[PDB]
Design an enzyme around this catalytic site. Sequence first.
Site, PDB file in Angstrom:
ATOM      1  CG  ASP A  16      -0.529  -0.063   2.518  1.00 12.67           C
ATOM      2  OD1 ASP A  16       0.683   0.193   2.715  1.00 12.67           O
ATOM      3  OD2 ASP A  16      -1.332  -0.350   3.441  1.00 12.67           O
ATOM      4  NE  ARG A  30      -0.824   3.204   4.227  1.00 14.64           N
ATOM      5  CZ  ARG A  30      -2.066   2.729   4.132  1.00 14.64           C
ATOM      6  NH1 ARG A  30      -2.771   2.911   3.022  1.00 14.64           N
ATOM      7  NH2 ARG A  30      -2.607   2.037   5.142  1.00 14.64           N
ATOM      8  CG  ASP A  35      -4.055  -1.408   6.853  1.00 12.93           C
ATOM      9  OD1 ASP A  35      -2.905  -1.027   6.536  1.00 12.93           O
ATOM     10  OD2 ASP A  35      -4.303  -1.902   7.965  1.00 12.93           O
ATOM     11  CB  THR A  36      -1.638  -4.102   1.995  1.00 15.67           C
ATOM     12  OG1 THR A  36      -0.630  -3.102   2.231  1.00 15.67           O
ATOM     13  CG2 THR A  36      -2.400  -3.768   0.661  1.00 15.67           C
ATOM     14  CD  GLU A  38       2.990  -2.743   7.796  1.00 16.32           C
ATOM     15  OE1 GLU A  38       4.133  -2.613   7.293  1.00 16.32           O
ATOM     16  OE2 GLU A  38       2.094  -1.865   7.689  1.00 16.32           O
ATOM     17  NE  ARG A  76       2.711   6.978   4.973  1.00 16.19           N
ATOM     18  CZ  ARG A  76       2.174   5.941   5.600  1.00 16.19           C
ATOM     19  NH1 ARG A  76       2.708   4.729   5.452  1.00 16.19           N
ATOM     20  NH2 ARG A  76       1.094   6.100   6.351  1.00 16.19           N
TER      21      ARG A  76
HETATM   22  C1  LIG Z   1      -4.084   5.829   4.689  1.00 20.06           C
HETATM   23  C2  LIG Z   1      -3.810   6.912   5.708  1.00 20.06           C
HETATM   24  C3  LIG Z   1      -2.929   6.692   6.767  1.00 20.06           C
HETATM   25  N1  LIG Z   1      -2.678   7.693   7.646  1.00 20.06           N
HETATM   26  C4  LIG Z   1      -1.790   7.475   8.799  1.00 20.06           C
HETATM   27  C5  LIG Z   1      -2.623   6.956   9.961  1.00 20.06           C
HETATM   28  C6  LIG Z   1      -1.761   5.887  10.617  1.00 20.06           C
HETATM   29  O1  LIG Z   1      -1.018   6.472  11.712  1.00 20.06           O
HETATM   30  P1  LIG Z   1      -0.086   5.608  12.703  1.00 20.06           P
HETATM   31  O2  LIG Z   1       1.231   5.412  11.995  1.00 20.06           O
HETATM   32  O3  LIG Z   1      -0.008   6.528  13.901  1.00 20.06           O
HETATM   33  O4  LIG Z   1      -0.777   4.279  12.918  1.00 20.06           O
HETATM   34  C7  LIG Z   1      -0.802   5.443   9.521  1.00 20.06           C
HETATM   35  C8  LIG Z   1      -1.252   4.155   8.839  1.00 20.06           C
HETATM   36  O5  LIG Z   1      -0.334   3.919   7.772  1.00 20.06           O
HETATM   37  P2  LIG Z   1       0.263   2.448   7.490  1.00 20.06           P
HETATM   38  O6  LIG Z   1      -0.906   1.515   7.317  1.00 20.06           O
HETATM   39  O7  LIG Z   1       1.121   2.690   6.272  1.00 20.06           O
HETATM   40  O8  LIG Z   1       1.070   2.160   8.725  1.00 20.06           O
HETATM   41  O9  LIG Z   1      -0.804   6.473   8.543  1.00 20.06           O
HETATM   42  C9  LIG Z   1      -3.313   8.958   7.512  1.00 20.06           C
HETATM   43  O10 LIG Z   1      -3.084   9.866   8.364  1.00 20.06           O
HETATM   44  N2  LIG Z   1      -4.148   9.209   6.497  1.00 20.06           N
HETATM   45  C10 LIG Z   1      -4.434   8.241   5.595  1.00 20.06           C
HETATM   46  O11 LIG Z   1      -5.218   8.486   4.668  1.00 20.06           O
HETATM   47 CA   LIG Z   2      -0.306  -1.309   5.784  1.00 23.25          CA
END
Ligand SMILES: Cc1cn([C@H]2C[C@H](OP(=O)(O)O)[C@@H](COP(=O)(O)O)O2)c(=O)[nH]c1=O
Ligand SMILES: [Ca+2]
Length: 131
Positions: A16, A30, A35-36, A38, A76
Site C-alpha cells: 500500500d 500511501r 490497508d494491506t 505488513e 507520504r
Molecule cells: C491511509 C492513511 C494513513 N494515515 C496514517 C494513519 C496511521 O497512523 P499511525 O502510523 O499513527 O498508525 C498510519 C497508517 O499507515 P500504514 O498503514 O502505512 O502504517 O498512517 C493517515 O493519516 N491518512 C491516511 O489516509
Molecule cells: Ca499497511
Amino acid sequence: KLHKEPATLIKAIDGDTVKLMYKGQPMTFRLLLVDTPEFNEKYGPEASAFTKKMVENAKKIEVEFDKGQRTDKYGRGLAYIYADGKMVNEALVRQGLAKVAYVYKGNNTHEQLKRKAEAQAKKEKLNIWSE
Ligand SMILES: Cc1cn([C@H]2C[C@H](OP(=O)(O)O)[C@@H](COP(=O)(O)O)O2)c(=O)[nH]c1=O
Ligand SMILES: [Ca+2]
C-alpha cells in the site's frame, strides 16, 4: 471533481506504499482508503507482489488526489494510484489483499467503490477472507 495527474514509478515498496516521481520530485505515496498486511504478516508478501507487478507493468502511472489532506504526518502523499487506467487501491481490495480502512471525512470520494469491491472479495472468500 477529481483529476488524474502524471507520475512515473521510482520503486515498488509494499502492498500500500510506492515511490513515485511526482511533479519531478521523489515522493512515497500511501494508497488512500486501504490497508494491506505488513510484509511480515499473513498475505503481506502477496499484497506486496500484487502492487509491485501492477505498477512495474504499467505504461502509464497516474496519481489522483482526493479533496482533503494530500500528505500524511509522515510526509507520504495520499492518493488513488492508477496503472494503465486501473486503480491499484480498488484492485487490492477486490482481490482480498487489502481491507477498506482509514476512511477519514473529506478524503473518501472512492469509499463506496471500495466497499463494493470488498463485499465481492468477501463473498468469494478471497485471500484475507479465506480464513
Ligand atoms: C491511509 C492513511 C494513513 N494515515 C496514517 C494513519 C496511521 O497512523 P499511525 O502510523 O499513527 O498508525 C498510519 C497508517 O499507515 P500504514 O498503514 O502505512 O502504517 O498512517 C493517515 O493519516 N491518512 C491516511 O489516509
Ligand atoms: Ca499497511
